[PDB]
Design a protein around this ligand. Structure first.
Ligand code: PRO
Ligand code: PRO
Length: 290
């Protein structure tokens, strides 16, 4: 049982769950993917507390339990100013370890470029610095899928017929291959997905699905700026992650001293596929740069 509460940031209420660590050695701020999902599917990281690591979970604007601002503010740039404000409001000047998953990773990167002075380390899992690149890679993944699912994605996708059952099949197949490779997904994940579909952030900023980025982040690309990051950076990417290792490499190539860890048999939600290993490597990294 962690403490849950509402924080008023930039004129709106943001829900956050703080799981303090007994003999806390450091704090970890987390950023969920999407955009438009929730912190829920990241709960697995809570195990970090037993390692003396406090973990801050929170639903970004318009996500999960938080309220949406003006649509004109559905941007990554705003998401950054939201993270800082929360950081500043919840912890003050105390520096912290920022972690970002998927979109949260791209968001985390944008944050570091501006407020790395408030960070001690950066952990990017399945993240990205360029949306277009992430898109071209996924396309390769699609063409690598069974003909039926590949032609169903191109056929029904070019028409916006995402409701199509066949299209749906191709989507879930893709997910059970590059999003999460396991029989039954944990409730935590299903809720984040449930949230993305309930709120309006995922529909506007991201688009129809994971491999269909028609949202307002279509052209985003700060690969040319992530180079200014100097803090201890840890990058992870599933072997079959929807955001391919090539996307993780481009990042790891711009951040000197960064580490790249490709988890075998894992995909996107590596924190669930390999909970132990994931939580381990992340805590090891942190406990190395206090
Ligand atoms: O977490 C997400 O939704 C981003 C955008 C699609 C690929 N990964
Ligand atoms: O139906 C889909 O594929 C989208 C993907 C995120 C959750 N719902």
């Amino acid at each position: 049982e962690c403490i849950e509460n509402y924080a008023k940031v930039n004129g709106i209420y943001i829900y956050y769950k703080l799981c303090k660590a007994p003999e806390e050695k450091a704090k970890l701020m987390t950023m969920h993917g999407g955009p438009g999902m929730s912190h829920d599917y990241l709960l697995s990281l809570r195990d970090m507390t037993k390692e003396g690591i406090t973990v801050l979970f929170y639903d970004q604007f318009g996500c999960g339990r938080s309220e949406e601002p003006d649509q004109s503010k559905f941007t990554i740039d705003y998401g950054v100013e939201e993270a800082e404000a929360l950081r500043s409001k919840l912890f003050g000047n105390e520096k912290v370890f920022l972690m970002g998953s998927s979109y949260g990773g791209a968001l985390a990167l944008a944050y570091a470029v501006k407020y790395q002075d408030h960070l001690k380390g950066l952990i990017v899992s399945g993240g990205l610095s360029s949306v277009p690149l992430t898109v071209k890679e996924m396309n390769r993944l699609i063409d690598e899928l069974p003909a039926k699912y590949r032609d169903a994605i191109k056929k029904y996708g070019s028409s916006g017929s995402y409701e199509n059952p066949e299209y749906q099949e191709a989507v879930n197949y893709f997910y059970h291959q590059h999003l999460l490779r396991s029989e039954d997904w944990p409730p935590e994940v299903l809720k984040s997905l449930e949230y993305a579909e309930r709120r309006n952030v995922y529909r506007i900023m991201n688009g129809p699905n994971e491999f269909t980025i028609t949202g307002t982040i279509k052209d985003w690309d700060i690969t040319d700026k992530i180079s200014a990051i100097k803090i201890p950076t840890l990058i992870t990417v599933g072997e079959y992650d929807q955001v391919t290792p090539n996307v993780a490499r481009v990042i790891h190539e711009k951040i000197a001293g960064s580490e790249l860890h490709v988890f075998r048999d894992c995909s996107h939600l590596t924190m669930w596929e390999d909970r132990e290993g994931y939580n381990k490597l992340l805590s090891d990294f942190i406990l190395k740069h206090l």
